[PDB]
Amino acid sequence: ASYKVNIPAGPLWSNAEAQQVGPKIAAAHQGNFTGQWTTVVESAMSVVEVELQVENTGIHEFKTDVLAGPLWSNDEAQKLGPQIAASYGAEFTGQWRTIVEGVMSVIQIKYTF
Amino acid sequence: ASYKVNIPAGPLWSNAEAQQVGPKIAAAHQGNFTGQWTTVVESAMSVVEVELQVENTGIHEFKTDVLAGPLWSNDEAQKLGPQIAASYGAEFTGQWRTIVEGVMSVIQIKYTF
Ligand SMILES: CC(=O)N[C@@H]1[C@@H](O)[C@H](O[C@@H]2O[C@H](CO)[C@@H](O[C@@H]3O[C@H](CO[C@H]4O[C@H](CO)[C@@H](O)[C@H](O)[C@@H]4O)[C@@H](O)[C@H](O[C@H]4O[C@H](CO)[C@@H](O)[C@H](O)[C@@H]4O)[C@@H]3O)[C@H](O)[C@H]2NC(C)=O)[C@@H](CO)O[C@H]1O
Ligand SMILES: CC(=O)N[C@@H]1[C@@H](O)[C@H](O[C@@H]2O[C@H](CO)[C@@H](O[C@@H]3O[C@H](CO[C@H]4O[C@H](CO)[C@@H](O)[C@H](O)[C@@H]4O)[C@@H](O)[C@H](O[C@H]4O[C@H](CO)[C@@H](O)[C@H](O)[C@@H]4O)[C@@H]3O)[C@H](O)[C@H]2NC(C)=O)[C@@H](CO)O[C@H]1O
Numbered sequence: 001a002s003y004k005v006n007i008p009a010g011p012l013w014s015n016a017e018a019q020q021v022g023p024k025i026a027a028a029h030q031g032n033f034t035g036q037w038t039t040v041v042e043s044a045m046s047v048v049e050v051e052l053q054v055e056n057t058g059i060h061e062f063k064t065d066v067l068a069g070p071l072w073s074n075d076e077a078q079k080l081g082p083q084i085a086a087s088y089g090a091e092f093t094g095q096w097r098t099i100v101e102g103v104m105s106v107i108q109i110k111y112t113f
Numbered sequence: 114a115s116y117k118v119n120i121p122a123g124p125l126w127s128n129a130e131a132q133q134v135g136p137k138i139a140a141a142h143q144g145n146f147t148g149q150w151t152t153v154v155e156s157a158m159s160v161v162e163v164e165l166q167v168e169n170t171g172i173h174e175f176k177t178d179v180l181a182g183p184l185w186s187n188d189e190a191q192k193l194g195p196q197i198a199a200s201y202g203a204e205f206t207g208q209w210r211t212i213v214e215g216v217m218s219v220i221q222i223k224y225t226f
């Protein structure tokens with residue numbers, strides 16, 4: 001199954017640029033550029049519509065840490081981790097850590113491609 | 114300046130749950146949940162509207178690697194890196210590498226929060 005969402009691309013100055021960059025942004029997020037896009041902040045930010053898969057499959061995997069906002073306990077981290085990982089189109093491994101006390105934590109995610 | 118995009122949150126089964134989960138997804142992406150959300154794939158995926166900043170500012174930073182899709186050369190990576198990093202709400206550091214020949218590459222991004 002698939003769905004669509006707009007993904008930031010930084011400022012895009014013309015449709016010609018957007019049509020060429022959109023596919024690259026989509027590939028980075030394991031999706032497909034739909035061709036639709038728009039500038040959301042004049043001369044500062046544009047977004048591209050990307051079709052994503054509900055479930056990413058494949059024989060390869062890559063693990064890394066991404067921002068998860070502040071997580072105050074392992075209990076909270078184990079509960080929210082799966083959903084935060086899903087927001088990155090990945091899975092939560094269960095590993096995580098606060099990188100700045102009282103400010104920010106990160107969760108380890110696993111990409112499948 | 115701020116702009117909005119819908120961010121995946123995995124399946125959300127009720128507004129009651131979405132109102133509790135949306136803020137957490139938003140925080141992980143350095144944004145604010147607006148309260149608006151919707152299921153895009155019945156019983157499988159929902160998205161939450163998040164207000165993002167054109168430029169993420171703050172006194173802290175965090176570097177990490179994320180998927181960039183396959184990058185075929187340093188010339189291409191240096192050209193697309195900034196835009197791919199922007200799609201993650203971060204900056205490109207210039208460092209990158211292919212993790213699976215002919216299939217996937219990753220770029221190092223720098224979050225500021
Ligand atoms: C950062 C910055 O300020 N840059 C601006 C540039 O944005 C601007 O160039 C124009 O940018 C607009 C978007 O902001 C372009 O209009 C959008 O075009 C895309 C693509 O549409 C084409 O391709 C599709 C797929 O092939 C076709 O289906 C479609 O028919 C077209 O052939 C559309 O997806 C957008 O539509 C969405 O957004 C608009 C709102 O913007 C909604 O109304 C729609 O319902 C839909 O949701 C836009 O139509 C425009 O083409 C760009 N112009 C040129 C000449 O490239 C640039 C020049 O003004 O200025 C920079 O500063
Ligand atoms: C925003 C803020 O300030 N919040 C803090 C809270 O962070 C803090 O709660 C503790 O937070 C730390 C992380 O900073 C927790 O420790 C980490 O736990 C995870 C999860 O480990 C469990 O689950 C895994 C999966 O099931 C199991 O494999 C594992 O055995 C555990 O059961 C680990 O992934 C981390 O370990 C990794 O990272 C560290 C650091 O790089 C490495 O050294 C390790 O080798 C490993 O790679 C940590 O162990 C800790 O559990 C939290 N404590 C509690 C009680 O919940 C809170 C309290 O201090 O204060 C808030 O303010």
Ligand SMILES: CC(=O)N[C@@H]1[C@@H](O)[C@H](O[C@@H]2O[C@H](CO)[C@@H](O[C@@H]3O[C@H](CO[C@H]4O[C@H](CO)[C@@H](O)[C@H](O)[C@@H]4O)[C@@H](O)[C@H](O[C@H]4O[C@H](CO)[C@@H](O)[C@H](O)[C@@H]4O)[C@@H]3O)[C@H](O)[C@H]2NC(C)=O)[C@@H](CO)O[C@H]1O
Binds near residue numbers: 126127149152154
């Ligand atoms: C995985 C799965 O299948 N899950 C489904 C659940 O989705 C479903 O529960 C309903 O889900 C729908 C969305 O899919 C909910 O409707 C949306 O509600 C949000 C929130 O709206 C409230 O909160 C806002 C902020 O406080 C207020 O402004 C607003 O007035 C409400 O109080 C809205 O943001 C959505 O609106 C957007 O999307 C719709 C399309 O869905 C557009 O038409 C709108 O224009 C807008 O863009 C929706 O209105 C609904 O509330 C959920 N129902 C309940 C009872 O929780 C559940 C039951 O049907 O079944 C699960 O399986």
Ligand SMILES: CC(=O)N[C@@H]1[C@@H](O)[C@H](O[C@@H]2O[C@H](CO)[C@@H](O[C@@H]3O[C@H](CO[C@H]4O[C@H](CO)[C@@H](O)[C@H](O)[C@@H]4O)[C@@H](O)[C@H](O[C@H]4O[C@H](CO)[C@@H](O)[C@H](O)[C@@H]4O)[C@@H]3O)[C@H](O)[C@H]2NC(C)=O)[C@@H](CO)O[C@H]1O
Binds near residue numbers: 208216218
């Ligand atoms: C999908 C696919 O198969 N594509 C491959 C291409 O990858 C391949 O092109 C080469 O790709 C490698 C990466 O896999 C390139 O090497 C990396 O380059 C970046 C950038 O380095 C430059 O820029 C930095 C910033 O300006 C400078 O600091 C640096 O000095 C350079 O000027 C580096 O960040 C990488 O370094 C990391 O990885 C290596 C290897 O793991 C570590 O040793 C380092 O410590 C660090 O962690 C790499 O050095 C390489 O430049 C690409 N080659 C060319 C000619 O573009 C292509 C050709 O082989 O084939 C495709 O199929």
